[PDB]
Design an enzyme around this catalytic site. Structure first.
Site, PDB file in Angstrom:
ATOM      1  CG  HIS A  76      -0.473   0.301   2.515  1.00  0.00           C
ATOM      2  ND1 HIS A  76      -0.146  -0.663   3.443  1.00  0.00           N
ATOM      3  CD2 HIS A  76      -0.292   1.494   3.132  1.00  0.00           C
ATOM      4  CE1 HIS A  76       0.247  -0.080   4.564  1.00  0.00           C
ATOM      5  NE2 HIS A  76       0.176   1.233   4.400  1.00  0.00           N
ATOM      6  CG  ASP A 100      -0.176  -3.925   2.568  1.00  0.00           C
ATOM      7  OD1 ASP A 100       0.112  -3.411   1.441  1.00  0.00           O
ATOM      8  OD2 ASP A 100      -0.408  -3.224   3.613  1.00  0.00           O
ATOM      9  N   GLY A 156       2.748   6.546   8.832  1.00  0.00           N
ATOM     10  CA  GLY A 156       4.042   6.657   8.174  1.00  0.00           C
ATOM     11  C   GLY A 156       5.062   5.644   8.644  1.00  0.00           C
ATOM     12  CB  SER A 158       3.071   0.900   6.831  1.00  0.00           C
ATOM     13  OG  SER A 158       3.336   1.733   5.724  1.00  0.00           O
TER      14      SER A 158
END
Ligand code: ZJG
Ligand code: ZN
Length: 198
Positions: A76, A100, A156, A158
């Site tokens: 993502h 992901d 911010g 991830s």
């Protein structure tokens, strides 16, 4: 519109989380202007150091973590993008939208974390602000924050690691679980899911 079709830029390393010493702190290695140009060319001559990189595209910023010679992050954030490197854009070597997850070969100069085999549930999440947040493991892909805090503090981060007490990689931070804006738990990609992907 064939003549005008644009290409998305590369992911660019813009800094790192320094875990070298007793004190964790974020370092910026490239400003927004130089990030924009490096994203377009895919040519990044900056020296890379450390395990946890701060990365950016033109529209998003997040983290990326080296584990066993692969720089891992979230789909993502990166999509299918290349990453900038000294010799030009580097294509992903792993892409898994269902988890992901994406990964590129780890950049020359990076240091990689070792996959955890401790089976411990006392974890530590490292954020883009170099906060080291205790997290109790609650399942294969979930951990609870010992001290909840607004999701703003996690945005911010991830692509950052969850570490065991011995500093091994247990997983990659993917998503935050919140009530009324307060992050109570985190969702993460377990390192075993990376290790099978490899
Ligand atoms: C496109 O193809 C895709 C394939 C698979 C996929 N799989 C996902 C689970 C996913 O989730 C998205 C993005 C993350 C996110 O925001 N990731 C963090 C982050 O920091 N991103 S980031 O800012 O760096 C950014 C956006 C620049 C990259 C870590 C958070 C921090 C704060 C939370 C903010 C409110 C959001 C709270 C959400 N909760 C949640 O979904 O919880 C449930 C999952 C099971 C419970 C949440 O976290 N997300 C919602 N998108 C995708 C997309
Ligand atoms: Zn361990």
């Amino acid at each position: 519109h064939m003549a005008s079709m644009k290409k998305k830029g590369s992911v660019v390393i813009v800094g790192r989380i320094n875990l070298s010493g007793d004190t964790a702190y974020a370092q910026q290695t490239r400003g927004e202007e130089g990030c924009q140009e490096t994203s377009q060319t895919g040519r990044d001559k900056n020296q890379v150091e450390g395990e946890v990189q701060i990365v950016s595209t033109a529209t998003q910023t997040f983290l990326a973590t080296s584990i066993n010679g692969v720089l891992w992050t979230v789909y993502h954030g990166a999509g299918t993008r290349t990453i900038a490197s000294p010799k030009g854009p580097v294509t992903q070597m792993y892409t898994n939208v269902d988890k992901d997850l994406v990964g590129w070969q780890a950049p020359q100069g990076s240091r990689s974390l070792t996959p955890c085999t401790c089976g411990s549930s006392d974890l530590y999440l490292v954020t883009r602000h170099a906060d080291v947040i205790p997290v109790r493991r609650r399942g294969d892909s979930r951990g609870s924050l010992l001290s909840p805090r607004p999701i703003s503090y996690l945005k911010g981060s991830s692509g950052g690691p969850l570490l065991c007490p011995a500093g091994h990689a247990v997983g990659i931070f993917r998503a935050a679980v919140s009530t009324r804006g307060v992050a109570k738990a985190v969702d993460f990609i377990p390192v075993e899911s990376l290790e099978t992907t490899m």
